[model samples]
Target chain A: EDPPACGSIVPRREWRALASECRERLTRPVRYVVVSHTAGSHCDTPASCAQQAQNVQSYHVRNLGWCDVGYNFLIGEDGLVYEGRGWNIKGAHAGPTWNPISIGISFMGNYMNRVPPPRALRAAQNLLACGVALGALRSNYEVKGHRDVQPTLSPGDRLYEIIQTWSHYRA
Target chain B: EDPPACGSIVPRREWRALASECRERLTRPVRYVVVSHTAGSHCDTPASCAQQAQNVQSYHVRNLGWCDVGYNFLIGEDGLVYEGRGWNIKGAHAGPTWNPISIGISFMGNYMNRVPPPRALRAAQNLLACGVALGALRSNYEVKGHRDVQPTLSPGDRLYEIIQTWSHYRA
Candidate 1:
């Protein structure tokens, strides 16, 4: 049987991304999955999310001087998964130690007080499952809140509380 | 006593694990334990067994392009438990359907024609006990040989014979 593409991702081209200069590949079967949130804008429709994805890349490349968007993937409140760095590229979201070792996925909203829509959460989980099937992630992966590794509340307070109940959360 | 570092596991560093990535996590408290054998080499001393563990991880991660070693834990003839992916992460030792739902452990040696040393068997049983104690595994976990899930001569004929006598074994 044919394997599913890693996470039903909307490719960078689909999002109309600028050419990414990133070259390093994250070693496959990433051991850690770090969840975060844009904490800036929330988008529920395809057009809005696509614009949000581009805006994120623009901030990273133009403002932050990064090679590309910080996250390997971005989740939309619209229940879509958008490609950032995608499966193999190293992301700039987390600190240096985590960037090379983990896949960073951010939801496209500030979840500090509000929970992401159920469809958004489901899309994120499904993306992780697809990663395992594609051999892009290890079967025994660990899920982490952005706050777990960094000082900021990235994935937001409300979302953080929810992921705590997940079966794979450690520490 | 503090749950023994995630199920009485010797850390990956202790076994000299290569910097490899893994992609998935199994939902916990897992209810099944699948046992198998390396069918490659055996070692009785700490140094030798650690080397064997490294070799196994190398095969899975480097040769097979797996995120990490396939097993959750590996029992050595030295009567020690070597951590593979540990208790929380899903393992590749079993098939996709079972991998996410079960803990897969392998005895570090071919057990097809010969039984694993008594100490090796004891280590595996004791490790399972620790897993239950730490709330990493279900108290009523069922044990099964690798052949039970996949079509293969794994956990070998002789070792398969021994595990069937265990109280937790199902079918």
Candidate 2:
């Protein structure tokens, strides 16, 4: 059920730490949170998927140069939470105006071509809820998919349905 | 409160017309519906804002190759619906991929720097409700600000907030 290297959504306790980091890093009150499905990982193969995710996260933190990956948090197919922006640094996730003030949470997989797998969804929810508890969230704050922010064919065609129930908001 | 020549939201109840037209125009179901605020003539000036809308639904309808504009419909500050594309013609307002299947709806205003009057919001709601009722919408159908579909800062910040409340799926 869980990926070999990381498992079960990264422990909510850890997310609290990440959330605090976000509160400290951001300059604006996060009135919204953006959720993106990276449609890049080859999750069809499990190990590759996990490794791809970890690799991307590392690259994001290191190459992107923001303390961690640009996302406030990242969820993997294995249902692991990989800390990225750490709440203390600005994320490059939401483009310009939105990213600095909004928290970016990305799911590692191209949900557009494939379903995000149940575990991914649950982990995302947990992280989002954790965000809500940390006071980094607005009760009616926006939850947007990547496509909502910029003009890209991201999050793909099939998987954006996750937002149908609990996603996207207006500024 | 009305634009000078604003047209009806939909010429008539042409649900079948819209579906057939959209299918002919596209290979897939529509996804995000891009919206823009006209802000063309009457936005900044008080008297012009008070004047009748120009009924320039032509731009919305003409975006498609069809004889008229391709927007499913247009809304006016007067709470009027100017039917363009008769509900199904498919719009060319957004870029290519998102355009064919996406419905383009615009409001009459130079709202680039101003909020849409309550009257305009009412008209928008009326037109949007009509589009949903006509069906033919894809599972991912969304009422997105034009900025989401393009680089233009349109539909203004305030009206964008007003319009997003209707983003929820009805069916």
Candidate 3:
């Protein structure tokens, strides 16, 4: 497929320059963060606006016979740790998971499980922010977690809590 | 919900009426048809668009549980049929389905999956026309299918083939 010209971040060279600047300024390790696992456990759950935030609700894993670690990073329900692929192979989060490689992390709990826990979300922010300082991340290395990619129920309700606070993590 | 305002069709009455009309106008037993699925099944379809059409890409039916089916009607890979609640309740669709109920329909194949198959799309058009007469389908109802709801990818690349010929199905 010829790629959509619209999704481009624009001024690729400028972006690169800015990225370099951030790299120099932050002098921190940056990593990719992802949320895996749809919150809807089965095919029978109702789609709720609240639940939609989770982002991972789907049948792809079991019925579709897909890899379990669909996302490069995973965020958990308790909003504690973020996990992901080992950063070698492409991530399963978005079609464009190659965006970041260093710290591919996913959240555990389905964001759709309920509004995400504030604490867990905070943890995600800190985790990614800390990763940035590690120099593992580059530019545009901020959140676009599981829920960000698609209108799924993966990151679910609690995503906003973390999203609101994540600006501090941006490059 | 609150009283549906003035001209809105009362819930049970409207649902029964549209379904009744659809059943009555049938020259042959109508099956479900779909133009698209949730995740651009037709466009991506390594395998099936049905899951995508139904928006069950991840295959977890949980989040989708309580919400009415995305389409009032859906077609399976084998050309089987499934009904969406959108038709039964006030349509999220236009035309008859829009006012009182929408006969949301979908075809199993992503017409864009390959070359435009005139016969398949024609068949879908004819079926939609049939749905119109009996169910009080509106203008948007007649020749329209999935892509009408949003932009891009549905009924396939060949949708333009029959786009003009579906006026009768409209209000």
Candidate 4:
């Protein structure tokens, strides 16, 4: 299968990812993709989002004692996808049960009461399509909000409402 | 819609399901059934499995600060079904994506290298059939291992292998 080339994604090096010891690989093609938000400050520019990505990584690795950033990918309001644990490694994003089977992608903003920019949504949709193209995701993958699984308000209420309307959403 | 009444289920009362708040209800006739394992200890008698069920709930509620136990149902080596969040309520068993759209039935024990007793498997199968009978699950409902939708070696290796052979298994 062709590599996922859905959109222009900022590579881990470009985003300054630290060396990680996490080596678990998600068995492909994954059947689910979970959407979440950082519930942190929003960034609307590439430079700012890059900094936010760094901040998230620092929190997960240093504070949480994790090997790397929690999510497999991070989406910026600037419409760029920042590589995190990437496609091959398991993410610490969703939870122990979810981290192994699903790809976690987070928007770098609190969407609890606010909507992400149109570009941000577009980028995320594109990324899922790319994952399917690359055999990373199942063709019939389902999507859901963070709060739907874990006991946290993630991906916010506003974003959660919007994603419910997406064609790929099952619940 | 008629409530799902499937199999020889140990009511939440028997297992002492806490009077926990449930966040949402799953839309009925769900198309997926996610099979998982507790990855903890197994119990072969109703008395022991009931205790095991209580312990599972304690971890999810007191320890994890969740409203209730994660899975919709728990199967025991004793060939009994333990009610968790049940069929109507959304469960925390699978990750966000699959939780809202599917029914999660976890076997109570570590099945990594070992297989659950045949009676346990039979109970799980019968439970799914009942879900269909009650229109709580789709007629074409598909079965997936816990590892299929999230991270973790849940439902264990041997069980995962067996599930793949079921007629309803997807991916």
Candidate 5:
């Protein structure tokens, strides 16, 4: 028997996530990863990042009236990857075209001007490796900025520039 | 053969709608109809309602960055129904469970305080009849308020009350 957890990634309970009512599941071994930024507040401590995760979830759930947080996961300046809808569920972060086929991970904070700390970047990269280890993403999955597939300035200028340099990045 | 127009309904060209980029289609002969309200400004004349219709579509397309307006049709206080995503396209209104199965029609402006005028109500009912005539809706399709399916005050207090009295409204 296997533990119901992915190693190193923070579980929803650890960050106090709301109970999810998500019903749509993604077909496994998804082929794409779309990166985005909250374009909101930045948090560097575990405590503050957890609160930001809750804030982002609250907006998506309560304000947008979505079933849960719109991302598959969220990374923080605290260098942690917080679980969102998780690996199996479909997310609403991108438009319909990409959402069903990709994992959406958003960094917490505006990144138009500044790049995330290296540890934060590493946390996201590490999360992707775990996704492959757990068979949620294809070994050859491609990474893209939120702006690459949509009309928004998400995952911002500095962060967008950095993601393009990742080994898995496409365009 | 029937004329391509659904009698008396305003065409997208008349309202000067932006060309849509939507790709998905509804399965057709949809079984349910969900009603909603704009929760924005009211318009009582042809010119004003046309402007309101454009504003609503612009918000969905430009701000929300959706493919087109979220509704299948929009009824105006000016006593006209404006084509939205229309009978053939899947709308973005409501959540996923209902969006695919229902025809979404929204009445323009807030219905929390005042009910839409008699003509506006008639326009919506007439549009429903057209939907049936055009084979877009089941003859016995049920009508529900936006608040009925999701957690929101859409189709508002007064209009929600009015919809409940209609023959097709359920719960």
Candidate 6:
């Protein structure tokens, strides 16, 4: 699909994403939404953030040999959500046990030292609402930090704290 | 185990393998042995070859975030075998589907253009016999090229050709 159903999401074509071959599917109304941080450079401009998304996709595809970007969607300091594997597809974000059950959305920056801008956080929260509307995520879906499920410093110390306070978050 | 069962094989300590924590065990008498190549530099001297093994392990551990080097054993042009995860441990060599069912053995260098020296081949052959003797590998285990199981140019052209001629090679 050249364009995605979610009008809010920047189409893959808009980012000039590389050809992808990921085919695994996730059962709808996924129970969890995994929040993560790229832990790389963050972008505050639309153009630069688009490139950042492309760069992350390149590492997952080229270096890791994963089928596509590991996240279901990516948030940018540009205050936009970039489409990743999207809602119905299985993500590579969490390890095997969690990937199939969660929608992974990563912010494009290290949240260890700083929190994503307010706009970035809004973009992600709005994306979650859209996922529920699309029947991709359960209405009561739980929010989880990447570190809560895997052994890593992902979603960062600052970000993890914020996610814990989110409406649907669970320990 | 601090020291391994095969005396001919250089222990992990000999090469200063970093502290590893890969604990998943393979079912004994694994049905297959998958051969692969590093697709990297070759070494002919014992000192250099051992360093090459250490280099490969570092990349897998530090860069790739794997628990240890992915192979069960490594063969060197120096005509020696180096222990990897070894024997009963499930290796990370093949994909999830195949890794648990097979013992992974990799050559220390790319074999795309040149064949591994005969002594290297002999070392690998002997290691296979040793695995069977230890009851880690089934006596009738099938030998396979990395390419046969995964989509990569591992255990390269020259080496794959040799693998096909080995006694237990199925394809």
Q: Among these predicted structures, which one has the highest TM-score?
A: 6
With candidate 1 superimposed using the best TM-score fit, by how many Å does residue B92's alpha carbon deviate from the native? 37
A72-122 in candidate 5: lDDT tens per residue?
999999999989999999998766678899999999998878989998999
lDDT of 3 by residue, A1-171 (tens): 433222211121321211111111112344445444443332211223213222332232333233333443334444444233323344334432233343445444445435554555565566555444443455456554443443333444555445545653332
TM-score of each: 0.50, 0.42, 0.34, 0.55, 0.55, 0.56
Residue-level lDDT tens digits of model 1 in A19-74? 99999999997999999888778999999999999987786677545678878899
lDDT of candidate 1 vs native? 0.82
Q: Show model 2 residue runs off by greater than 4 Å.
A: A1-24, A27-29, A42-50, A61-67, A167-171, B1-171
Candidate 4 stretches with Cα past 4 Å from truth are: A1-92, A95-171, B1-6
Candidate 5, position A138, lDDT: 95
DockQ winner between 2 and 4, please give it.
4
Query: What lDDT score is found at residue A55 in candidate 5?
Result: 87
Ranking by TM-score: 6, 5, 4, 1, 2, 3
RMSD for all candidates, in order, please.
19.5, 18.2, 17.8, 15.9, 8.3, 10.3
> Across residues A1-171, which tens digit of lDDT does each residue of candidate 4 receive?
454557578988887878887888888888878898887789999899889999888877775557788799999999999998877788877776677889999999878579998999999999998888888888999997776666345677889999999988876
Against the native complex, each candidate's DockQ, computed on alpha carbons, is 0.01, 0.02, 0.04, 0.04, 0.05, 0.04
TM-score of chain B of 4: 0.95
Q: What fraction of the reference interface contacts is present in each model, in order? A: 0.00, 0.00, 0.00, 0.05, 0.00, 0.00
The residue pairs that clash in candidate 5, if any, are none
Per-candidate local distance difference test: 0.82, 0.55, 0.38, 0.83, 0.87, 0.84
How well is each residue in A104-125 modelled by candidate 6, as lDDT tens digits? 9999988767988899989999
The sequence of per-residue lDDT tens digits that candidate 1 reaches over residues B1-171 is 453563356788877798758767788899999988886779999999999998888767764456888788889998889988887888876555577899988888877578777788778888888888778889889998876764345677899999999999986
Deviation in Å, model 4, residue B55 alpha carbon: 0.6
